[PDB]
């Protein structure tokens, strides 16, 4: 019987603007106090703009005060917030919610969220770096070996080993995405202590959007 | 943000309970009221205690709130698989100006055993080092629940510069896997005795160290 639905979101260029749409129904959120918070990938909540009374007024964190620029539309029943000269670090999540007061503050409904991407990232093709064997090579437990796979754009990424033959072991491990704004992961396959000296293993990756193969010997330190 | 502190994670079995400490400054807690906020995975943010303890609508007495000094605690009791969230501390800031917010914990209901993580670290390849590269790998597998801390040190020291670690995610067989990646120059790698990754999980520590040969 209420509820904020946030839309713009997507990827912009580092020194780029972009503007988010925040619709309410089932409430008039021109007579409410509003609010952006945002959410950096696996970290906590940053609170962004809040825009208050009849004027009306608009409040921004250091982070963004003099680049952002919170507004509303009494018409439409949307929220807005225009986003100037964005930096990678601007990257995140971005809700719209509802902020009201009692004793304290509090921001009791939430929008669905959208995405903000901020990177020059262009379709890169990735640098493949062997994994060698510990020399450590102990007569009890077995030896993990694998493949790095370094500074890509964008996801996915194809790895097998010995051209399908060997997935006995295999754990083909999520990307990271870097401050970069490139992807990097790594394959390690736990094969058997001994022959080690006679098994060739060949790590084969293939990054379709680049067009790039390669396959990558992985034999221990000499 | 993190200007207030939780723990990163807390677990307990299926009805059993849990506490979540939220920790702050005479400039926030200290003089303003702590709000508890509900985040299950792939959703927004629900508002569950406002005022220190006044719970929403439909919020059952089992989610408490508290304050005192510039403490705040969410007690949870009868813990079901549906608690299963990232849960935020907020107020505001008379300092900064600002609505703050804790890093966020990790709620895990147990439904399989404790399990440590597995690591194996790998140093730079000799090719990377030709390219004047290094990086250092990490590969964290089979824990459960699925939250780690990460930290690297160079020798003993704390290094912060050059790390990049990934969330846990879900393997095939139900436990959880990370990875985490340093990057250095040449001259840093070999000019270290060693570089070790420590992955702490559930309070306990398992610590990989490699050497430039």
């Known amino acids: 019987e209420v509820q904020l639905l946030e839309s713009g979101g997507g990827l912009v260029q580092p020194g780029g603007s972009l503007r988010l749409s925040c619709a309410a129904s089932?409430?008039?959120?021109?007579?409410?106090?509003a609010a952006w918070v945002r959410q950096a990938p696996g970290k906590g909540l940053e609170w962004v703009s809040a825009?208050?009374?009849?004027?009306?007024?608009?409040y921004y964190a250091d982070s963004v005060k003099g680049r952002f620029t919170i507004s509303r539309d009494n018409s439409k029943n949307t929220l807005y917030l225009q986003m100037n000269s964005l930096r990678a670090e601007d990257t995140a999540v971005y809700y719209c919610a509802r902020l009201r007061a009692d004793l304290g503050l509090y921001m009791d409904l939430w929008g669905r969220g959208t995405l903000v991407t901020v990177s020059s990232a262009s379709t890169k093709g990735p640098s493949v770096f062997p994994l060698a064997p510990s020399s450590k090579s102990t007569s009890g437990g077995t030896a993990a070996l694998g493949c790095l796979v370094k500074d890509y754009f964008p996801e996915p990424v194809t790895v097998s080993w010995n051209s399908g033959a060997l997935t006995s072991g295999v754990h083909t491990f999520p990307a990271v995405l870097q401050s970069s704004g490139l992807y990097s992961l790594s394959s390690v396959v736990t094969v058997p202590s001994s022959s080690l000296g006679t098994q060739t293993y060949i790590c084969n990756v293939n990054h379709k959007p680049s067009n790039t193969k390669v396959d990558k010997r992985v034999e221990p330190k000499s | 943000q993190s200007v207030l502190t939780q723990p990163p994670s807390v677990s307990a079995a299926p009805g059993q309970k849990v506490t979540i400490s939220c920790s702050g400054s005479?400039?926030?807690?200290?003089?303003?009221?702590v709000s508890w906020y509900q985040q299950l995975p792939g959703t927004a943010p629900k508002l569950l205690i406002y005022?220190?303890?006044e719970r929403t609508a439909g919020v059952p007495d089992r989610f408490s709130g508290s304050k005192s000094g510039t403490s705040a605690t969410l007690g949870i009791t009868g813990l079901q698989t549906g608690d299963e969230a990232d849960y935020y501390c907020?107020?505001?800031?008379?300092?900064?100006?600002?609505?703050?917010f804790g890093g966020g914990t990790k709620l895990t209901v147990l439904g399989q055993p404790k399990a440590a993580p597995s690591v194996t670290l790998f140093p730079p390849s000799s090719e990377e080092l030709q390219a004047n590269k290094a990086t250092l790998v990490c590969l964290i597998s089979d824990f459960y629940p699925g939250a780690v801390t990460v930290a690297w040190k160079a020798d003993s020291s704390p290094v912060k510069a050059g790390v990049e670690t990934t969330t846990p995610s879900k393997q095939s067989n139900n436990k959880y896997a990370a990875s985490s990646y340093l990057s250095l120059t040449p001259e840093q790698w070999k000019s270290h005795r060693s570089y070790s990754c420590q992955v702490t999980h559930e309070g306990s520590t398992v610590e990989k160290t490699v050497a430039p040969t």
């Open positions: 005479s400039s926030n807690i200290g003089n303003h009221y």
């Open positions: 825009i208050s009374g009849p004027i009306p007024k608009g």
């Open positions: 089932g409430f008039t959120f021109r007579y409410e106090v």
């Open positions: 005022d220190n303890s």
């Open positions: 907020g107020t505001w800031d008379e300092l900064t100006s600002n609505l703050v």
